[PDB]
């Protein structure tokens, strides 16, 4: 097993996956460490075999059918998995807790949103479609280039975007696209 967590990159109090080498941190994983389970598979082993089960998963799809489907297990897991793989790149953590708006020259959004609180939302099952988790992921860059502008700091929500973007095509297999 690795001895750094697989989300945060640090040591310290980390449980192992049984199937594969990755540890985490108890709230690094996303759902957090289950209490007992021994054999324990983390998130990555299981969206691996969701894949494995339905190969044709993998098929390309539509952006619009996916944002459609209702929050079963399996697009439940698969939004926990994209959200995790948000909070991977170190830059998340300008996204993670409830952000304030006091600048010169701008306004806050009118509907603010973290990465903490979409944690809280999928833990609390307070999506019904996938949609719901899209749009509130999306909403956290786009507060956050409306309010800095042309401060050159506005390039670390066109970043991050692209990380959650990208993850969102591969893990909900979206149509390759020119
Ligand atoms: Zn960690
Ligand atoms: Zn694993
Ligand atoms: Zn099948």
């Not at 539509?62 to 959200?83: A, D, H």
Request: net charge neutral; with cysteine.
């Amino acid at each position: 097993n690795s001895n750094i967590c697989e989300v945060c990159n640090k040591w310290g109090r980390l449980f192992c996956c049984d199937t594969c080498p990755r540890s985490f941190h108890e709230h690094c994983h996303i759902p957090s460490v289950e209490a007992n389970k021994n054999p324990w598979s983390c998130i990555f082993c299981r969206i691996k075999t969701i894949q494995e089960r339905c190969p044709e998963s993998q098929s390309g799809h539509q952006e619009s059918e996916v944002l459609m489907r209702q929050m079963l297990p399996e697009e439940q897991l698969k939004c926990e998995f994209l959200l995790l793989k948000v909070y991977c790149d170190s830059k998340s953590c300008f996204f993670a807790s409830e952000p304030y708006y006091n600048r010169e020259g701008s306004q806050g959004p009118q509907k603010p949103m973290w990465l903490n609180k979409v944690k809280t939302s999928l833990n609390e099952q307070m999506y019904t479609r996938v949609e719901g988790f899209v749009q509130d992921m999306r909403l956290i860059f786009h507060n956050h280039k409306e309010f800095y502008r042309e401060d050159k700091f506005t390039r670390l929500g066109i970043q991050v975007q692209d990380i959650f973007e990208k993850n969102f095509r591969n893990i909900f297999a979206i149509q390759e696209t020119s």
